[PDB]
Enzyme design. Structure first.
Site, PDB file in Angstrom:
ATOM      1  N   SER A 185       0.651  -1.201  -0.040  1.00  0.00           N
ATOM      2  CA  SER A 185       0.011  -0.012   0.087  1.00  0.00           C
ATOM      3  C   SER A 185       0.797   1.365  -0.088  1.00  0.00           C
ATOM      4  CB  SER A 185      -0.795  -0.008   1.162  1.00  0.00           C
ATOM      5  OG  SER A 185      -0.414   0.052   2.386  1.00  0.00           O
ATOM      6  N   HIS A 213      -6.243  -4.876  -0.951  1.00  0.00           N
ATOM      7  CA  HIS A 213      -6.144  -3.783  -1.704  1.00  0.00           C
ATOM      8  C   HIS A 213      -6.210  -3.869  -3.436  1.00  0.00           C
ATOM      9  CE1 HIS A 213      -5.020  -0.243   0.730  1.00  0.00           C
ATOM     10  NE2 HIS A 213      -4.389  -0.994   1.596  1.00  0.00           N
ATOM     11  N   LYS A 244     -12.802  -1.424   2.338  1.00  0.00           N
ATOM     12  CA  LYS A 244     -11.963  -0.716   1.215  1.00  0.00           C
ATOM     13  C   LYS A 244     -13.140  -0.919   0.058  1.00  0.00           C
ATOM     14  CE  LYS A 244      -7.824  -1.093   3.391  1.00  0.00           C
ATOM     15  NZ  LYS A 244      -6.585  -2.140   4.004  1.00  0.00           N
TER      16      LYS A 244
HETATM   17  C1  LIG Z   1      -6.614  -1.926   5.370  1.00  0.00           C
HETATM   18  C2  LIG Z   1      -5.772  -3.025   5.808  1.00  0.00           C
HETATM   19  C3  LIG Z   1      -6.063  -3.816   7.121  1.00  0.00           C
HETATM   20  C4  LIG Z   1      -7.077  -3.198   8.022  1.00  0.00           C
HETATM   21  O1  LIG Z   1      -8.399  -3.091   7.561  1.00  0.00           O
HETATM   22  P1  LIG Z   1      -9.613  -2.778   8.582  1.00  0.00           P
HETATM   23  O2  LIG Z   1     -10.786  -3.506   7.985  1.00  0.00           O
HETATM   24  O3  LIG Z   1      -9.713  -1.198   8.259  1.00  0.00           O
HETATM   25  O4  LIG Z   1      -9.104  -2.956   9.950  1.00  0.00           O
HETATM   26  C5  LIG Z   1      -5.370  -4.832   7.861  1.00  0.00           C
HETATM   27  N1  LIG Z   1      -4.287  -5.560   6.824  1.00  0.00           N
HETATM   28  C6  LIG Z   1      -3.994  -4.825   5.473  1.00  0.00           C
HETATM   29  C7  LIG Z   1      -3.105  -5.447   4.588  1.00  0.00           C
HETATM   30  C8  LIG Z   1      -4.798  -3.573   5.032  1.00  0.00           C
HETATM   31  O5  LIG Z   1      -4.549  -3.320   4.028  1.00  0.00           O
END
Ligand SMILES: *Cc1c(COP(=O)(O)O)cnc(C)c1O
Ligand SMILES: *Cc1c(COP(=O)(O)O)cnc(C)c1O
Lengths: 399, 399
Positions: A185, A213, A244
């Site tokens: 990310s 992602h 997301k």
């Molecule tokens: C966004 C993300 C998280 C966290 O997700 P939430 O549902 O917002 O707690 C955990 N691990 C990775 C790799 C992420 O990209």
């Protein structure tokens, strides 16, 4: 002196930064949200280019209708854990939606993606086991490692060679969990999962991949970089989020392992927290099912990302990737003052992007991070580029 | 053998229990929820007596209206962290509601109560600090300890004397965090917080109290056992949840400490997770504000608890407390077979209660745990007692 005294240097550093009058990146409030791509911030109508709403699901009329109906039929919340009174038809239906989306025999929903990583990683690997992870892994993966009692093995960022080297020194009979992410990310580049999975299986490791992602826009069915990479059959566990692409809140892990359901009994971040509200599992389930067929949004997301990436590099910006490898685009700057002036200039011109700073980034590197949305119109992407051009010239980042 | 092989004994133990044909307490699904007190389970209309919906807020018409409106105005989710793009007006308004409810200068909302404990405890106490906690503390408090790098000090359950003794041996200059709970959820008895807080302050410890199980029904303003105990001015941090009395999902910590807001920058379970959906912070804020004036619900909750407690003991049940000390009532059984027969008998007669088992309880102790709801009618409490009487006699637990 007390337990908060250890933060005094940070507080002092912050007050000194704020004393200069610069805009505070930790004080952005979306006063009103007009669409997936626009919000009112401090009285100014602002294009959002720093969200993870990749598929623009947050205002989907079916998603919203499902949420409202769930509130009427099932109430504001479950008031219990999944293992007691908190499993409603919606929770099971949401897990079925995940099983269908990923083509897996099992799906366990957590209350956050953070908890999904924390729980899976801290539960799978115990005393005498090893967790092998990219040096630049997400904080939630690290927190999983730190909560658990396994030996931790960091491999150099994005190095198949170093992963292979590190795995080979580990004791033959120790349990090994390789944790990988599909998309990194920070810079928005993708992992070479085909090579890394093959290296991992050669050493007898179990493999957990985070696909937070890429959901909806990598792989034949949108399952993530691991599906695109063709290693679906060799990945033991896939963790993701509802916060997301899905556009709500929650986490999950999917798997074909025949003993997988036992985790509901032992995984502490699953057991010792309330299940999600009915409205959340209803909106998540509806969003997930639409994401299975969201070819139009997916195609437009990629078009947007490629246009923005090409446009930014063409006008003189230095980017974290040579080509658009995902929906995240990182602009690299070498001066903190310049980075803040550009970010603030963009914000005041009506564009919101995220920023990254040391020690999150390596010393001397300052990032503006852009994340495209399927609902950004062709015209907005042109406006965005126009704003970067204007602000970039005003701040001397580009000629 | 792989990373799930360590669960083989548990899986085998479970299959052997299920092979006898007994109903599975980990497979309860609420197919339909009719009200805060009734649901359809496996085709049977069932009174719910195993939820933490203490104040019956889950179907409050104002709460539900607030949720629906938030979905329309702000969408299904924020798609970002609080520290980036995920702070909406609703998140700030919810924190203001908490400040008003608790009378504090600060309020930090987390995405779960689990994360609130995990984050507060793992962030406040670092290397060279000590966390002092009840041996029988909630798993989320333990996970906070295990994630962090502090020295851990367990004191004997409910022993002011042992707390004092243990604190006195700790190094004078080390940071010390005493973590206490207002209500012990297993038996539903309350902690002697007046005595424990005084002992803690005498040793110069900072104090964090969990008030997840008394919100809205202990203390002049419903702030919890700590307010009832008169030690509000001596408690540094109060952690709670949105998933019980409030009736949604989420966590929080409130405080008057002048440096408290710095935690938003460093607390990893706050920073590295998405903020809650607009519908969740809207419903939570509306529920919290109504809980400030919910004298009627509070009075009826206590009436219900006292009636059930008195009725159960009067017909021959042995309870975890001599008097109703909270809205939780624990029925103590000495035989596993009898405990399952009673629980299953109640379920089949149309009453759902929770159960507890070793190693969650001490060896040789099996519990049925009842949790009253403000919306249980006088008539339902009489029905409940009638069901306990019938099932109890059928199973030989009472004459
Ligand atoms: C966004 C993300 C998280 C966290 O997700 P939430 O549902 O917002 O707690 C955990 N691990 C990775 C790799 C992420 O990209
Ligand atoms: C219920 C509870 C929690 C967990 O709250 P969630 O919001 O359901 O995660 C944490 N700590 C204590 C003491 C609790 O009672």
């Amino acid at each position: 002196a007390d337990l908060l005294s250890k933060f005094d240097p940070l507080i002092a550093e912050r007050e000194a930064l704020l004393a200069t009058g610069v805009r505070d990146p930790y004080a952005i409030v979306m006063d009103k949200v007009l669409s997936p791509t626009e919000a009112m911030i401090n009285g100014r109508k602002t294009i959002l280019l720093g969200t993870y709403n990749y598929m623009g699901m947050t205002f989907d009329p079916d998603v919203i209708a499902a949420g409202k109906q769930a509130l009427d039929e099932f109430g504001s919340g479950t008031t219990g854990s999944r293992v007691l009174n908190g499993t409603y038809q919606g929770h099971k239906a949401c897990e079925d939606a995940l099983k269908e989306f990923y083509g897996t025999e099992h799906a366990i929903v957590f209350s956050t993606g953070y908890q999904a990583n924390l729980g899976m990683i801290s539960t799978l690997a115990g005393k005498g086991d090893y967790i092998i992870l990219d040096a630049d892994s997400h904080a939630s993966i690290y927190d999983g490692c730190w909560l658990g009692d396994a030996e931790i093995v960091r491999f150099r960022h994005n190095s198949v060679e170093d992963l292979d080297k590190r795995l080979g020194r580990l004791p033959a009979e120790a349990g090994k969990l390789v944790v990988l992410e599909g998309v990194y990310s920070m810079m928005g580049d993708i992992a070479p999962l085909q090579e890394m999975v093959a290296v991992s299986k050669k050493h007898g490791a179990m493999i957990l991949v985070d696909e937070a992602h890429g959901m909806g826009f990598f792989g034949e069915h949108g399952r993530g970089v691991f599906e695109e990479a063709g290693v679906e059959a060799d990945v033991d566990f896939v963790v993701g989020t509802f916060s997301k692409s899905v556009g709500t809140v929650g986490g999950f892990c999917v798997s074909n392992h025949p003993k997988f359901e036992v985790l509901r009994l032992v995984c502490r971040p699953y057991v010792f927290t309330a299940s999600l509200p009915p409205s959340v599992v209803a909106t998540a389930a509806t969003s997930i099912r639409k994401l299975m067929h969201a070819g139009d949004k997916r195609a437009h997301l990629w078009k947007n990302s490629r246009r923005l990436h090409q446009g930014l590099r063409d006008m003189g910006y230095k980017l974290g990737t040579e080509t658009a490898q995902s929906a995240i685009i990182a602009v690299i700057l070498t001066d903190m003052a310049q980075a803040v002036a550009l970010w603030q200039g963009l914000l005041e011109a009506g564009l919101y992007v995220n920023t990254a700073r040391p020690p999150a980034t390596p010393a001397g590197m300052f990032l503006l991070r852009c994340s495209l949305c399927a609902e950004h119109s062709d015209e907005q992407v042109e406006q965005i580029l126009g704003m970067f051009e204007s602000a970039g010239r005003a701040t001397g980042v580009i000629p």
